Each structure stands twice: as C-alpha cells, then as structure tokens.
Amino acid sequence: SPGIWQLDCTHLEGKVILVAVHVASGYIEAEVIPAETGQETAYFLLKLAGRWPVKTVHTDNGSNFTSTTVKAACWWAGIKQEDGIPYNPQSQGVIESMNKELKKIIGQVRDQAEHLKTAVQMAVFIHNHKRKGYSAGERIVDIIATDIQ
Amino acid sequence: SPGIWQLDCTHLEGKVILVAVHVASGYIEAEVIPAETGQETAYFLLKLAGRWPVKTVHTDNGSNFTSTTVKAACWWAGIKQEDGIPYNPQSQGVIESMNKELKKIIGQVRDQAEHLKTAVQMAVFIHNHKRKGYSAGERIVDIIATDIQ
Ligand SMILES: O=C(O)c1c(/C=C\c2ccccc2)ccc2c1OCO2
Numbered sequence A, B: 001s002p003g004i005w006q007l008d009c010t011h012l013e014g015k016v017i018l019v020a021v022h023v024a025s026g027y028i029e030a031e032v033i034p035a036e037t038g039q040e041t042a043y044f045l046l047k048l049a050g051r052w053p054v055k056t057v058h059t060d061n062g063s064n065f066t067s068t069t070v071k072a073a074c075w076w077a078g079i080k081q082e083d084g085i086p087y088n089p090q091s092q093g094v095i096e097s098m099n100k101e102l103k104k105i106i107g108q109v110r111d112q113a114e115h116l117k118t119a120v121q122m123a124v125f126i127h128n129h130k131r132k133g134y135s136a137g138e139r140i141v142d143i144i145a146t147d148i149q
C-alpha cells in the first residue's frame, strides 16, 4: 500500500494533464503535456519514481500498459507495472471526482497564471495542502515513514 | 530544519540544471532548463512547494533573490525566501561536491538516454535512492514525519 500509485489522464484547453495519485493518501503529482504518448508517460514515471518510493503503478489505459517505452521506464525505475481496471468500482468515481476537483481549482487560479502548466502546479499545491484533520501531503509522509520504520 | 531547502544551478552540455536540495537529508529534485531566469526559477519553486512542505529557500544567487517573479512565487507558495550566502563555509564545498557527484552519475547513464533531461532524472533517482544506512529519500520522509507528529 505505501508504494501504490495510479495514473490518470484528463483534458483541459486542448491539452493533456497527466496525474499520478498515491492511492492510500490522495497525494498527487501532475504535469501538462501536449498529448499522452508512451514517451511522455515514461518520462513522467521516471520523475515520479526518483522522488517517491514507487513500487506499483496502475496504468491509466491499455496503450500505456502496452507501450514498450513505458515498460522500459518501469523496468529502469524498479516499478511493477499493472493494469488500472477498477475491480472495486468505487475507483472510477474517485478518479472522476478528483479530476472534477482539480479542474475546479484550476478554474479558481486560472487568471493568476498566463500558462496552464502554472495553474496546474498551483492546483497540485492546493490539493496536497488541503486539510480534510490531515492533508494528503501529511498522509503520504506518515504512511511511508511508518513503512520504512 | 525540516522545511529548509537550498537552490543550486549547475551547467552541462550548454544547458542549465536547476537543483533543489533538502539540506537536512540531501534529497534533491532537479530539472533541465535552457537558461536560469526568474520565470523558470519561480515555476520550479512552485512545483517543489506543491510536492514537499517547503518553508525556507536559500536562493542560489542574487539575481534570483532579487527577481520579482521569484518573490511572487515564494509569496504564493508560503516560502520564506532567503539569501544563500555560506556563513558556514563547509556549505560551498558540499554543494560543489554534490554537483560533481550529479555530473558523474549523469555521465554513467548518459548513453541510456537521448536527452539530457532524462539523464538528469535518472541521476535524481540514483542520488535519492543511494544508501549511505539510510538513503536521502528515507531521511527526508523520516525528518518530515517526525516534525508533523
Ligand atoms: O504566468 C505563468 O504561467 C507563469 C508565472 C506567473 C505567475 C506565478 C507563478 C507561480 C507562482 C505565482 C505566480 C511564473 C512563472 C512561470 C509562468 O509560466 C511558467 O513559468
């Protein structure tokens, strides 16, 4: 559980927002890319795994699951690549809810930034600091620290 | 101490590598940029502060310290912006040593990646996982978790 992440791809302003969610905490990292390719997804995962102890990734679709470049990145970074099929159906709804939330926050900051990528990073900040009480940022650190110890 | 980071700018292949080091752990995040501008530094700090609880940043030079855009990002993200003058002289040498180390790792992976940015992220991964025994990634999580609790 401490090492499990889920990929999520959502769209805004004709652009693609790639999101990784740490399933147990709700903590996220995200980037704007022009389109969701294996190459972009691979690079994103490499970045993520250098920054957090990523053991398992549930990929967001079959193209990324199949991608040789994504498989290469997962091999390189020691990530178990899995499918992202919601065997538990409450999963789709949770992802859907998070995308709606992220887009709402993006709307709330959009005028403070010229570029979408900046608004997305503001949204990441607000999401990860939001008190729900602990924040998602607090939860991920606590979860991982408990695991290490 | 849990919230203190140091900026570091180093050069390779006619490009600029911007690094943030969590001083107490040695954990890093890094990006390749075409040149070190206030705009790029501001965006980098926004990303960092959305991902870790960044309280204080020791800026890497006077241009970034002065930059209105960097100041705006620090204000937005709740970061205390400080100078990076090594009042303790062992600091320059530690930064210097880390840049040499990062470049060495980059050299060791450079042929596995077409693009420098990929090699830099491989270097981030290797650096943060390296056991010294705890890794820098383990140290940062432990330090922050102890603070939160
Ligand atoms: O306007 C932008 O999108 C933008 C900005 C602007 C505001 C801003 C950005 C971060 C925090 C507070 C304010 C700055 C750097 C950037 C930007 O784009 C990439 O690097």
Ligand SMILES: O=C(O)c1c(/C=C\c2ccccc2)ccc2c1OCO2
Pocket: A039, A040, A042, A043, A046, A069, A072, A073, A074, A076, B112, B113, B114, B115, B116, B118, B119
């Ligand atoms: O060749 C690259 O630099 C490159 C690569 C290649 C290898 C690679 C990258 C990550 C992990 C293992 C292998 C892949 C995606 C990318 C890349 O550039 C941006 O997105």
